[PDB]
Every structure is written in C-alpha cells, then in structure tokens.
Amino acid sequence: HTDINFTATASFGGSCYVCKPHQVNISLNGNTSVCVRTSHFSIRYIYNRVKSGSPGDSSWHIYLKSGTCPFSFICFSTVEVPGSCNFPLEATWHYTSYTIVGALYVTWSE
Amino acid sequence: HTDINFTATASFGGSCYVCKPHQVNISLNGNTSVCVRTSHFSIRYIYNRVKSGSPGDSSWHIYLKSGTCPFSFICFSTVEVPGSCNFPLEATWHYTSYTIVGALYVTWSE
Amino acid sequence: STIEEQAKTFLDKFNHEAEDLFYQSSLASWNYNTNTEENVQNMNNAGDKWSAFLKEQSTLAQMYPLQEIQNLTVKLQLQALQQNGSSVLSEDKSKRLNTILNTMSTIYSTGKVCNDNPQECLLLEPGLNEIMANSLDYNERLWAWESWRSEVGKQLRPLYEEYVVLKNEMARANHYEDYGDYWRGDYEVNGVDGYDYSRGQLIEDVEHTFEEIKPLYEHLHAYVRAKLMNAYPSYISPIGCLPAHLLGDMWGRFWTNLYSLTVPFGQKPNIDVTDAMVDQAWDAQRIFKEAEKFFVSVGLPNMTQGFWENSMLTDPGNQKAVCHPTAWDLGKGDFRILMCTKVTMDDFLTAHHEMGHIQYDMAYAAQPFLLRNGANEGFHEAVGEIMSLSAATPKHLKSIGLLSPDFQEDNETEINFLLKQALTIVGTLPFTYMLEKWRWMVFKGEIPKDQWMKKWWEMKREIVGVVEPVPHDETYCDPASLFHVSNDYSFIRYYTRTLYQFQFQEALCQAAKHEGPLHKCDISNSTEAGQKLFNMLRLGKSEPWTLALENVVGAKNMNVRPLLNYFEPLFTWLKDQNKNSFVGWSTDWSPYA
Amino acid sequence: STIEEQAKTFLDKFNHEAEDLFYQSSLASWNYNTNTEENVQNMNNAGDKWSAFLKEQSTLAQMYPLQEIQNLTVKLQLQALQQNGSSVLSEDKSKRLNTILNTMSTIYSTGKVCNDNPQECLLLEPGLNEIMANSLDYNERLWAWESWRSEVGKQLRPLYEEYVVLKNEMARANHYEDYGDYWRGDYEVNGVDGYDYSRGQLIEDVEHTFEEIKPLYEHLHAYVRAKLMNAYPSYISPIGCLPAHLLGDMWGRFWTNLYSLTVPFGQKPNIDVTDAMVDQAWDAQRIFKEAEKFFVSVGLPNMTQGFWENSMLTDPGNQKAVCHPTAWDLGKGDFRILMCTKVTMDDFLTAHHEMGHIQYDMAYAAQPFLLRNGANEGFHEAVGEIMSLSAATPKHLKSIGLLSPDFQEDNETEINFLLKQALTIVGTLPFTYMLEKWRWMVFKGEIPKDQWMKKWWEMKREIVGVVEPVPHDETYCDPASLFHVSNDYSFIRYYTRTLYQFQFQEALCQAAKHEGPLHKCDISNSTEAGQKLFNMLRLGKSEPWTLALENVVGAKNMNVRPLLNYFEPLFTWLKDQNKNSFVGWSTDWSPYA
Ligand SMILES: *[C@@H]1O[C@H](CO)[C@@H](O)[C@H](O)[C@H]1NC(C)=O
Ligand SMILES: *[C@@H]1O[C@H](CO)[C@@H](O)[C@H](O)[C@H]1NC(C)=O
Ligand SMILES: *[C@@H]1O[C@H](CO)[C@@H](O)[C@H](O)[C@H]1NC(C)=O
Ligand SMILES: *[C@@H]1O[C@H](CO)[C@@H](O)[C@H](O)[C@H]1NC(C)=O
Ligand SMILES: *[C@H]1O[C@H](CO)[C@@H](O)[C@H](O)[C@H]1NC(C)=O
Ligand SMILES: *[C@H]1O[C@H](CO)[C@@H](O)[C@H](O)[C@H]1NC(C)=O
Ligand SMILES: *[C@H]1O[C@H](CO)[C@@H](O)[C@H](O)[C@H]1NC(C)=O
Ligand SMILES: *[C@H]1O[C@H](CO)[C@@H](O)[C@H](O)[C@H]1NC(C)=O
C-alpha cells in the first residue's frame, strides 16, 4: 500500500518575525500532488520548523484547520483543483496573529 | 526675823510695745525702802507681769543685773541713797532691746 | 510748741491707741480661722471699728502741716496717716464701691462650676486646681479652664467695669492720674537726697528691666512647647502660643506644676525629699523647729514662745479654717503662723518662706507702728522667697541630713533642679508683667469696655506667648478670674519681688563668701549675711526702699542681672536645644481655626 | 517608482537585517549576565557592529525625501531612521564624548567609599543603599551620604562639564536648541491633524501640571518632617527643609523606604504578605506563574514557552549577574525576564511590573521593527506600574489567597496603605521635576560652571523642600551621583510615567466597572479592561502618543487629576494633621548654622 507524509516545513523571520513565517514549503511526499492507486493508504500531517536560533520558534504553530469538506483526518494536492476540499493550513505566532499559509486540496470520487 | 519681797510689777504696751514696758512699780514690801532691825533676814526678787492679753508678755523679761557692790543675792531702797549698791533692774523684750527700769539701792555698815 | 514736737506727741498717743485696736482686729481674724462656736462673725465688726478709728485719725492728721516737719521719721508717719483715701467719695459712691468689692471677693470665693449634674460642682479649691495640676486630658482641662472663666468670670464683668469707675474717681480725686497711677505710688519717694523714685519711673524700670529678661523667657518658652507637644500630640503648634489650660494651673501663673512633662533628665534620682521625711517620722512640728533652727544660725532670734503656744500649724480638720499659708504680725509682741502642714519637701520650704515673713515682722516691730512693713510691696514677699532658695539647695538638704552626702551632684541634676526653679520663677515673670500692663492700660482709660478681652488676649499672645483655647467675647472678664484681680491687689509686686529676691541672694551669698553658681548657695551657718539682711529688715518702711536696697545690695534701684546670672547655666543649655526648635511665637495662630 | 513604494521595500529589507543584528546584540547582552566562561566580552563587540549597521542605514535613508512620503507608517520609520544623531560630530569629538560616557558610567558603576581602613570599602550596591535603607544614626547616614557624593561625585564634575559641551554641540548641530531641547523631542509630534505636541509644550504641561500637584506634596512633606523629628530629635527644624540623608535612600528619590517611622496607624495588622508567602512554600516560579495567571484573566496571552525555558528569574549565585529587575525584548519572538527573585511581597509586585513590560513587548512585536516601543518614554514604565496597583490591593491579595478574607478593611488600613504608596509615588514627583528642571537649565546654558551646585541646592530647598546636610562648593557634582544622570538618561520620564500611570488605572477601572476609591481597584478577571489596554499596547510607537492616550483615556494630553483623585482620602487626612503643624518650608534654614 501507499503511505503519505503531507509536510509543511517552515522557516522564520522576514521584515517581521511573528507577523508570518518567513517561508513555508508545502509538500505531498516531496512533490506537489499525489493520487492514490492502491485502495487503502495512510495520510499524516508533518509540521517541520527549521532551526532559527531563538526560542521564538516553538511558539510558532502551523496546524491545519478543518474546512471545505466532510471528513477531517481520491487524490491530494497543494494548489487548486476543481471540486476540492481545502483543509487550509493556518500559521500563528503564539495565538496572537493568524495567517493562512496554504491548504491541502482533496478530490474524491467515491 | 524679817523677810523681804523686793517686787517689780510691770505692765506692757505704750506708744510702742516691746520698746520698754509701759509701767513698772518697784517696791520693798509694798513701800519704798526697808531698814532691817532684826539680825538675820531673807530677801527675794519677785517679778510680776500684769496680764496684757498677748503672748507678747512672757517674752518680756525684767531681771536684775549685778552692779555697784560685792555681794549679788544694812538697808534697802528704791531711790538713790549716798553710798549705795545699785543692783540695777533691766527690762528686755526677747533680748532684742534693753532698757534699765530702776534699781535696788543697798546700804551696809558691817 | 514746734508743730513737729506737737505732732511728736500726737503720734505717740496715736501709736498707743492704734496698737491696741489693731491687736483687736488681728486677734479677731485669727479667731475666725483658729477656733468652736462664738468666733465666726466678730472679725467683721472689730475690723469696721478699726476702719472707724483710722478714718478719724486721718481727719485729724490734716491739721499737721507736713512742710514744718523736720524729723524725717515723723514726716513719714504723718504723710502715711493723712491720706483722705477712699473716704474722699460721695457717701453713696463710697458704699457702692464697698458693695462692689465684697460682691467680687465673694463670687470668686464662692464660685463653682457644675455638670445634667447641677447638684455636683467642684470649686476652685480642691475641685479644679487639683485638675489643672494633674489631668492630662486636653478636653477636660479645657472644660475646667472655660467653665471657670465663664461661670465666675462673666459674673465679674459688669461689676469690674463699675469698679474701675469709682476706683479711678477715688485716685483722680486724690490727685493721682488713675487708679493705676495710685498703686504705683507704693514705690514712690519724694524729698530724700538722690534717693527719690518717680511714680512712673516704675513702668519704665519694669519695661526696661523686661526687654532684658525677654531672651531667657523665649528659650524657656520654646523649650516647653516642644516637650508639651510630646504630651499633647496634635494640639500644640510650634509657630504659635501655648494654649492657656495646658500651663499647669487655672491661669498659668506658674508652670512649676506641670513639670514632670517638661523635665529634662528624668533618668536622675529625684530631688524630692518628700518621702525621705516620712521615713524619719517628721511631724509638722519638726519642720518649723528645723526652720527656726535655720534662722538661729544666721544671727537671728529663735521664735517667741507663744508663737509656739497659739500658732496653728497642723490643721484641726475636726473646726475648719483657711489653709493658705500665712504669717501673722498682730500687735503686742504677737507673732504666729497659720499653715495646714503636710510632711513634704514643698510644705518644708513653705515653712521657711512663712517664717521669713515672721522674722521680717520681728525685726522691725520696734519701728513706730505706722512704719512696721516691707520697704515696699514685695520686699516682704522677697524676704521669704530668698529663704526657700538657701533651704532648697543640695548643700542644705545634704547637711540637714534629709538627703545622704552619697548624692552625685553632676551637671545633670543641675538643670533638673534649675529648670523646676525657672518653671516657677521665670515662668511667672511675663505672666505678671502683662496682667498689670493690662490694668494699667485699663485704669488709664486706654482700653474701652468693648475691647477689654480682645486687648487682653492680644497682649497674652504678644507678650506672654499664650493663646486662649476658645474665643472670648466681651461678656467675659478673664483677668477677673484671678484672685489678686477680683480681691483688688496690686500684682506687679510679684514681679518686683522676684527681681529683688535675687539681688539679695547675690549680695547675701557674697557675704556668706560663696564660690560657685549662685543657685548652690545656702547662707545658713553664716551670721555675716544674716546681719547684712537684718540691717535692712529692722528698718521696716522707715527709710525709702531705694536706700533699704542699697543696704543689702549696692543699688538705689532694682536690677535684673542678679536673676539672669542665677539662671545662666540653664540659659546657655536651652539655646543648645533651641538650635533647631522654633524660638518665639506668632500672635496669629489659634487652636480654633 | 513612487519613492514611497521605493522606500517601502527599502524598509522591508532594513527590518529584516535589523531584526537579525538586533537579536545578535541582545542575545550577547543576555549572555553577559546569563552564563560559564566565554560570554564576558562578546556583548561589547556585537553591540558596536549593531552601532556600525545603524550608522550606515541612516547615511542611506537620507536619500528618501520625507516630503514625498504618503504612508504615515513609512514616514515615521524613515524619519526615525534618518537621524544624523551623534555621528554629526568631529571624529575626535565623537570619540571624546564616547570616552566620557564610558568613564562616567564606570566611575558610578565602580565607585566605592572607604574608611584608616583603606582596604575596607562598601559600594553603592549593598554597602551604602542597605545603610540608607535601615540605619538610624544621623552621623552614620550623613557619612554615607557625604562620602558617596564626594568620592564618586567630585570625580564626575570635570567630565560632566565637558559632557554638556559636546552633548549640546550634538543637539545644536541637529537643529535642536540644546541637549535639553533634544530630550524633550521624545514627546514631540508634527503634522498629525490636531494631535500635535510642541517640544517646549512639555515644560509648560509639566510646570502647569506641577502647580496642581504642589498642595498635596506639601502636606505630605510637612507630615513626614513631624514624624521624622520624633525619630531624629534635635536634628529637624519645623520651619525648614528635610536633610537629604534622612529620606530613606542615597538621594531621596523615593521615601518608600524609611516609612516604618512615618507609618500612621502602626497598631494595625501589617499588610506585608511577605511572610504569608514563605508559610505556603512559594518559590520564585510560583510568583511569575501567578503573575502570568493575572494577565491571562484580563484577555492577554500566557507567556511564550521559551520565555520560561531560558529566562533567569532565580539568581544562580554560584555565575554572578546583574540583579536589577529587567524585561528583555530581544528580536525573533524572544522574550525573557532577568530577576534575582526572593519570596517577598515586594518581589511579587515587581514580577507584575516586569511582566507588564513583557506584555507591552509582545503586544506590539508585529509593528515594524523601528516602531516596537512605548508610545513615548515612560509609557512603558507606566504600563508596568499600573499592574502593581491592581496587584497590590487587598481585593487582589484577598482573592489570590495570600491574605484571608477575615481581613478587616476599615478606614485605618486605608491610610496605612495609601500613605506607603504616596511615600513612593508622591514622594518622587518633585524630586524628579527638579532634577530635570536643573539639567534643562544647564543644557540651555543658564547656570554657569561656578554656580552649578549653589543653583542645584537652591532648587532642592526651593522646589523639593530638602537641604544639603553639608555645604557643597563647586568641586562637587551631586546630580551626577544618581544613576540616570551619569548614565545619560532623560529623567523627566519618571514624572510623566506617574501621571499617565493613573490616567490609565482610572479609565481602566472605569472599564472594569469599579465602584469605590480608585485605589481599591483590581482589573483582574476583567477582559473588558485588558482589551482597552491592549488596543493601545499593540500600537507601539506607531500612532503619536497623544492619540495612544486618547484610546485608553480620552485626552490627547497627560492629566494630573486622575492621580490627585487616587490620593484624595490621604489628602483630606493630612490637612487634618497639618491643622497645627507648619505646612511648607523655608529655603533659609540649614542644619549647619
Ligand atoms: C525723731 O524722733 C526720735 C525720738 O526719740 C529720735 O530718736 C530721732 O532721732 C528723731 N530724728 C531726728 C532727725 O530728729
Ligand atoms: C552649721 O551646719 C553644719 C551642717 O550644716 C553643722 O555640722 C555645724 O555644726 C553647724 N554649726 C552651727 C554653729 O550652727
Ligand atoms: C502602509 O503600508 C502597509 C503595507 O501593507 C499597509 O498595511 C498600510 O495600510 C499602509 N498605509 C497607508 C496609509 O497607505
Ligand atoms: C477570577 O478570580 C476569582 C478570585 O480572584 C476566582 O474565584 C474566579 O474564578 C476567577 N475567574 C476567572 C475566569 O479568571
Ligand atoms: C515520512 O515518510 C517517509 C516515507 O514516505 C519516511 O522515509 C520518513 O522517515 C517519514 N518522516 C517522518 C518525520 O515521519
Ligand atoms: C519528489 O522529488 C524529490 C527528488 O528531488 C524527492 O525529494 C521526493 O521524495 C520525490 N517524491 C517521490 C514520491 O518520489
Ligand atoms: C511675799 O511675801 C508676803 C509677806 O511679806 C506674802 O504675803 C506673799 O504671799 C509673798 N508673795 C510671793 C509671791 O511670794
Ligand atoms: C505699805 O503700804 C501699803 C498699804 O496700802 C501695803 O500694800 C504694804 O504692805 C505696806 N507695807 C508694809 C511693810 O506694811
């Protein structure tokens, strides 16, 4: 069968640290979308903070909200696909500011 | 034999009490001189204060000093007689002021 | 016959009759206090007969023209006797002034403050005086102070106004400026070679002897306020005057009293021998006997037996009499003291002070009757108070065996004692000056009826540094609440008294060959002094007081310095403390916004 | 491209680089205090690199003409960045001023007074401060006071004279009037619609906010002198100023300290929970956690984990660091507190005061780097102090379970507490006003070199009611003996601080719907307030401070009354005592003849 790390690796500290993460690569097993070809699979959300040097990281949280569609944790995708499922990815410093850094778009067929 | 009260009876308080007694009768058995006719006699000096009303009397003392002649305590006499013996009588208020109020004049023969 | 010679025998016969009748008025007053049943009211009769006699003899000494009197002694008597006096008044006005004086004497004598307890009252004796002496409750002391100055004060007002009218009219008629000018007359002397004293030269020699005593007073005053604040916190401002009812007695005449508060070195063994006595079973008799004994040593007589035998010195309390300590020179070699003696260091010193009076009386009792008196008012008072000093010294207490020589006499006990003395003495000086500075101004007709109280307190604050604790309008009459005001006495005497009092002790210690501070001196044992003293005592009012002084001191007039030099060690110590305190006061502060 | 738009991305890239480097200077300073071996001296390097960076970016923001800047936000940053600053100085003069500032900072930092015991010295830390805090020996405290102002004072003088020269020359070149005018610049704002503030309108609004605060001060002052006299008898005059070395610390900046003497109702159970804590085994951690917890309740965030994990709040003492309680906003979402906590009511309140700082820091950390700061100097200080108030009230202590509800809260404990607060607060206000009224006059060139000290104390006695205990000639330089003077800080902030501080607590308790006296208020539980507060916190120095106030209060400018009304119960009680005390002082008295 086919397992799926859905990774959001993040860095911190542009013109303002705290405002938004610096950069954030969103990835479905390294590449940008993955269509399942072997019925039953496994999907997980990994969140990866790149060492910045300050204990400011670790107060930086990126998690994914619920959103467009029924289930909460068939193809997956970074980037927009007609008839998707936006589990949108929200990034926050210490629950002060929120900023949505992307989404996981899903597409069913039943 | 013959006894002899020689009395000095005094009153107090003229224009000034204390200065001198007011009045003072001096007396040899009532009269003014006495000649002894019976060998051996007895002679005494009595001092008599007349009640005046104040405890000022009693601080008034009339006594007789010694004076002119040998013995200290033949005829006796109030008043002057040639060849006498003045035991003079001195009157004093509280030993402040002295004033001689008379004498007892004596006359011997041996 | 020389009208001098004709007055000579007139005076002889007068002195005889006067000594008889004056023994009668004096024996009857003694008997008023002294003894049973039938003695309560004879005093008043036999006094009016004395009054009757004295009046006749003036109307008859007017016939002896003074100008033709060579003998200085007979001049004086004649002068004294021949004073028209009060009789010189419209019959009704003479009575009405009497009527007034009695009323005033009695209201003060029998004035009482009460409580919803209209039955409960305290009087001035015990009652209030005992409160003003002990109590430490501002409000209570204020209540005592105000209740007295209200109940027996407002009563005295209309009577006191009328009293100055006739009282002046009597002086104005006797060719004195005012009744004030009249009293000053006591210190007057005319027609004696460079020994005179003007009737108004007194005011100046008081005022000009006051500016000199002002610095010492302020440092004592600014010192007490500081220690007072500590006893009454909240109440005493250190810019402003002291609140009268805090001064240890109804008027604040002496501060002697409230001293335990203003004591400097309270750490020290107390110099009150009061209990030392009790421990040696000393009775009222052992006091006076030890005081008699004092005098004997200074070259003076032991008391007349008979002074002993009918002098009341213990209090019967079983009989009731007036316990205010007094010395009585009735006529006829007759001297006694009336004093309700307690075993005390205070009642001990009072003995010396009263017997001093007797000694003065015995000294001059040879002078013609009319001259048997203190050279002036307050000579007599001084001659008694000069004895306390010698008898209230450690040197005295030590030797007399009432205080063991073991007693450490450092500079500490120095101020300890020297302060108490100044509370009593420096204390009263300004009080006194003002009290008469006020009557003087009244009797002159300077202060009108509608400012009497306002001008009084203005002066209390100004001169004495003391404020009324409550505002008083003109329904009040506060000076009248004092004895000597309502009972019609010149008061300035208490001042002059004190001034002389030291000049004596100075020259008298000089004679005793004394060495240190003037306050350690104890003239006892020293006949050398006693004679200097007697030489003036025996004189009575026979030469002018100005000369009488010169006998003891060296000056024709009073002087201030002897007093100041007595207090020198305290004065330079009080500045030490008032280095930082506020020294002086402002008229403008009052404890009532 | 719109120079605004060109400056927009210039600032973007600036903020980035600056946040990196400023995290470097801050991390190295933390490490100076925080940690081992290899940390002692890197701080000083990475700080000069920061300095080098900042200098370049100014020389390059000069190329962005402000006039063409529409965006109010970018304008401000640009304005802030492009200040020629100190660099605008002859190379040598720029170094020489540096040379001076370090020397002055170090002499104060490392100045010690010694004893024939030249080895034994105490420093300002423990040493003397611990004496000025406890000691009750006038001569000893005077020795501490004088020795410090002499050894580390006269050193500072020639340097301080030179320091005003170049320090002015720097301002005069920056088209400010004087270095004084320069510091006031902090409260300035231009070109914002009816929100402006003039550089010199501060002086007036201080002076005119001072006349209003003067009455309350004098009654507090005249009250203390009275209670002081009682602790130091002999030494304190009640017409004149207080002797500096009696005011509970080296300068008399606060009177908080010597209070046990000026306590009103010492009868009462003491409101120091200091030992209540010990009895519940509270560690330094239980304090801060209970303080974080405070904030959480008012609608604000719990501390960043990592603040916890490398913040130093206990003291290693095994390592040695600077224990002066500080809150650190290094870059990069990194906040921590450095504090050598003891189990105390004092260190408890300090926790709230420091964490208040952290909360302000976290609030605005989203604002572009350059504007991350208090709206003006002493906004920050106020936002910390406003927390103490809510956290030092009975209502707080009661609920927090550090004081049982059993506690009787009568009008007695009222003053008991409200006094201590005024000692600390009303205490410092006039001290502060004069200190800067002095430097302002110096930096203007009003006071010459030969009067500096004479005009200083003239002003201490005049404005503050305090006298030097010894004459100081001009070899001295006493203001220089205070931290914020020799370490070159504007001091007037401590004043403005206190004024706002209350305006806040007023409007903030208004939001919490409070009822009684303003001092009983305890905004905890009250999210309603916390948001009013945050609404200004998060703003940083982004809008002008005049507006930032109006968000929380309602006025574009500071106000005095919120403060006065907080102290109303104390004010009408001090008049009560000063009914009789002398209220105010004379310049003319001195403890040295
Ligand atoms: C006055 O009269 C008495 C009578 O004895 C006498 O002692 C005194 O010397 C007389 N004085 C003069 C000055 O004549
Ligand atoms: C005088 O007094 C001392 C003690 O005070 C005593 O010992 C001495 O004997 C006295 N002498 C006479 C003659 O009074
Ligand atoms: C200033 O720039 C920032 C960029 O996002 C923007 O949020 C802000 O609204 C701008 N202000 C104005 C007045 O244009
Ligand atoms: C607020 O504090 C009180 C006591 O101070 C406490 O009992 C209450 O539960 C608190 N509630 C919240 C939501 O913070
Ligand atoms: C995620 O899965 C990959 C294989 O797809 C595996 O090699 C890797 O170790 C996993 N990483 C984590 C963090 O679980
Ligand atoms: C997608 O490409 C990169 C190779 O550079 C790699 O990291 C990632 O694992 C690749 N994914 C898969 C599913 O092979
Ligand atoms: C004195 O003597 C007479 C007789 O001469 C006698 O009667 C009288 O009692 C005596 N008086 C006194 C006092 O002794
Ligand atoms: C002298 O005369 C009177 C008689 O009146 C009498 O008192 C006195 O005793 C007489 N003396 C003698 C000695 O008889």
DSSP C120-147: -EEEIIIIIHHHHHH---HHHHHHHHHH
Q: What is the DSSP string of D227-291?
A: HHHHHSTTT--SSB-EEGGGSSSSS-S--SSTTTTT-S-TTSPP--THHHHHTTT--HHHHHHHH
**Cα end-to-end span (Å), chain A:** 19
> What is the 3-state secondary structure of chain A?
CEEEEEEEEECCCCCCCCCCCCCEEEEECCECEEECCCCCEEEEEEEEECCCCCCCCCCEEEEECCCCCCCCCCEEECCCCCCCCCEEEEEEECCCEEEEEEEEEEECCC
Q: Which tokens belong to D321?
A: 């660091």
User: Which residues, in sequence order, are CB contacts of C267 under 8 Å at separation 6+?
Assistant: C412
Cα separation, D415 vs D373, whole angstroms: 36
Kindly give the distance from the C-alpha atom of residue D525 to the centroid of ligand 4, in angstroms, as a whole number.
6
Q: What is the DSSP letter of C461?
A: I
User: How does strand C326-329 pair with strand B97-107?
Assistant: unpaired
Q: How many domains does chain D have?
A: 1
Chains touching chain B through at least 3 C-beta pairs below 8 angstroms are C
Q: What is the DSSP letter of C587?
A: T
Name the one residue in this structure whose structure tokens are 């110590």.
C573
Q: Which tokens belong to D254?
A: 């606060």
User: How does strand B87-93 pair with strand C112-114?
Assistant: unpaired
Is some CB atom of chain D closer than 8 A to the CB atom of C239? yes
Q: Given the residues D169, D462, D484, D568, select the one marked as catalytic.
A: D484
- Residues 84..123 of D with a Cβ closer than 8 Å to C: which? none
Q: Which tokens belong to D2?
A: 């719109």
Q: Are D546 and D189 in contact (CB under 8 A)?
A: yes
**Inter-CA distances, C141 with C85, C136, C248, Å:** 42, 7, 9
What residues form DSSP beta bridges with A28? A6, A31
- From the CA of A41, the nearest ligand is 5
In this structure, how many other beta carbons lie within 10 angstroms of the beta carbon of residue C281? 8
**Inter-CA distances, D562 with C96, D441, D521, D546, Å:** 72, 29, 13, 17
Q: What is the DSSP letter of B41?
A: E
Residue D6, φ and ψ in degrees, nearest 5:
-75, -30
Q: Nearest-CA neighbor of C431 among C463, C456, C469, C454?
A: C463
Q: Are C221 and C395 in contact (CB under 8 A)?
A: no
Cα separation, D533 vs D552, whole angstroms: 6
Annotation says D484 is catalytic = yes
Minimal C-alpha gap between C203 and chain B (Å): 37
Cα separation, C51 vs C391, whole angstroms: 39
Cα separation, C192 vs D413, whole angstroms: 78
Residue type at D376 in one-letter notation: N
**φ/ψ bin of D415: left (φ > 0), alpha (ψ from -120 to 50), beta (otherwise):** alpha
Chains B, A in contact: 3+ Cβ pairs under 8 A? Answer: no
Answer whether B19 sits within 8 Å of C366, measured CB to CB: yes
Query: Which domains can be identified in chain A, with CATH numbers?
Result: 1-110 (2.60.40.3130)
Q: Are D535 and D528 in contact (CB under 8 A)?
A: no
Q: Nearest-CA neighbor of C29 among C14, C11, C49, C13?
A: C49
Q: Nearest-CA neighbor of C75 among C1, C2, C8?
A: C8
Answer whether B13 sits within 8 Å of C16, measured CB to CB: yes
Q: Nearest-CA neighbor of B10 among B53, B65, B62, B76?
A: B62
Residue B47, φ and ψ in degrees, nearest 5:
-110, 125
C409-414 contacts at long range (C-beta below 8 A, 24 or more positions apart): C411/C569, C412/C265, C412/C267, C412/C268, C413/C265, C413/C268, C413/C269, C413/C271, C414/C569
Q: Are B98 and C303 in contact (CB under 8 A)?
A: no
Element (H, E) at C91: helix C91-109
Is some CB atom of chain D closer than 8 A to the CB atom of C581? yes
Alpha carbon dihedral C211, C212, C218, C224, in 10-degree steps, equals: -130
Kindly give the distance from the C-alpha atom of residue A29 to the centroid of ligand 5, in angstroms, as a whole number.
8
Answer whether A55 sits within 8 Å of D12, measured CB to CB: no
**Inter-CA distances, C434 with C316, C428, C465, C495, D209, Å:** 39, 10, 11, 10, 50
Q: Are D488 and D101 in contact (CB under 8 A)?
A: yes
Residue C37, φ and ψ in degrees, nearest 5:
-165, -85
Residue count (chain B): 110
Q: Is residue D506 classed exposed, middle or buried when 0-12, 13-18 and 19+ CB atoms within 10 A define those classes?
A: buried
Q: What is the DSSP string of D84-129?
A: -TTTSS-HHHHHHHHHHHHHHHHHHHT-EEE---SS-EEEIIIIIH
Q: Are D47 and D29 in contact (CB under 8 A)?
A: yes
Is some CB atom of chain B closer than 8 A to the CB atom of C368? yes
Cα separation, C147 vs C144, whole angstroms: 5
What residues form DSSP beta bridges with C493? none
Q: Nearest-CA neighbor of C394 among C382, C412, C377?
A: C412
The experimental method is: X-ray
Q: Which tokens belong to D141?
A: 């405290």
What residues form DSSP beta bridges with A44? A5
> What is the 3-state secondary structure of C338-364?
ECCCCCCHHHHHHHHHHHHHHHHHHHH
**Inter-CA distances, D85 with C578, D15, D97, D169, D175, Å:** 57, 19, 13, 11, 11
Q: Are D390 and D516 in contact (CB under 8 A)?
A: no
Q: Which atom from ligand 8 is nearest to the alpha carbon of B31?
A: 1
Cα separation, C302 vs C284, whole angstroms: 17
Minimal C-alpha gap between D9 and chain A (Å): 10
Element (H, E) at C489: none
Residue type at C279 in one-letter notation: D
Rg (CA), chain B: 15
Residue type at D79 in one-letter notation: Q
Cα separation, D508 vs C168, whole angstroms: 79
Cα separation, D487 vs D252, whole angstroms: 18
Kindly give the distance from the C-alpha atom of residue B44 to the centroid of ligand 7, in angstroms, as a whole number.
10
> What is the 3-state secondary structure of C354-391?
HHHHHHHHHHHCCCCHHHCCCCCCCHHHHHHHHHHHHH
Minimal C-alpha gap between C456 and chain D (Å): 23
Cα separation, D85 vs D98, whole angstroms: 13
Angle among Cα C172, C175, C180 to the nearest 5 degrees reads 60
Q: Are C236 and D580 in contact (CB under 8 A)?
A: yes
Q: Are C168 and C439 in contact (CB under 8 A)?
A: no
Is some CB atom of chain C closer than 8 A to the CB atom of D234? yes
Answer whether D333 sits within 8 Å of A56, measured CB to CB: yes
Give the domain extent around D163. 1-593
Q: Which tokens belong to D517?
A: 């006296």
Q: What is the DSSP letter of D197?
A: B
Rg (CA), chain C: 24
Element (H, E) at D159: helix D156-173
Q: Nearest-CA neighbor of D525 among D396, D410, D363?
A: D396
B46 lines ligand 7 (CB under 6 A): yes
Q: Which tokens belong to D193?
A: 């619609």
CA A66, A67, A69, A74 dihedral sign is negative
User: Which residues, in sequence order, are CB contacts of C533 under 8 Å at separation 6+?
Assistant: C298, C383, C504, C508, C552
Q: Are B102 and B21 in contact (CB under 8 A)?
A: no
Cα separation, C9 vs D187, whole angstroms: 110
Which chain A residue lies closest to D534 (C-alpha atoms)? A96
Find the helix packing angle between C492-511 and C379-391, rounded to 10°. Answer: 50
Within 13 Å of residue C9, how many CA atoms lie on the same side as its CB?
A: 5
List strand residue ranges (DSSP E) for D299-450, in order. Answer: 326-329, 335-338
Q: Which tokens belong to D214?
A: 């003067």
Resolution (A): 3.3
Name the one residue in this structure whose structure tokens are 């609004």.
D205
Q: How many contacts, defined by CB atoms under 8 Å, are there between A and D?
A: 78
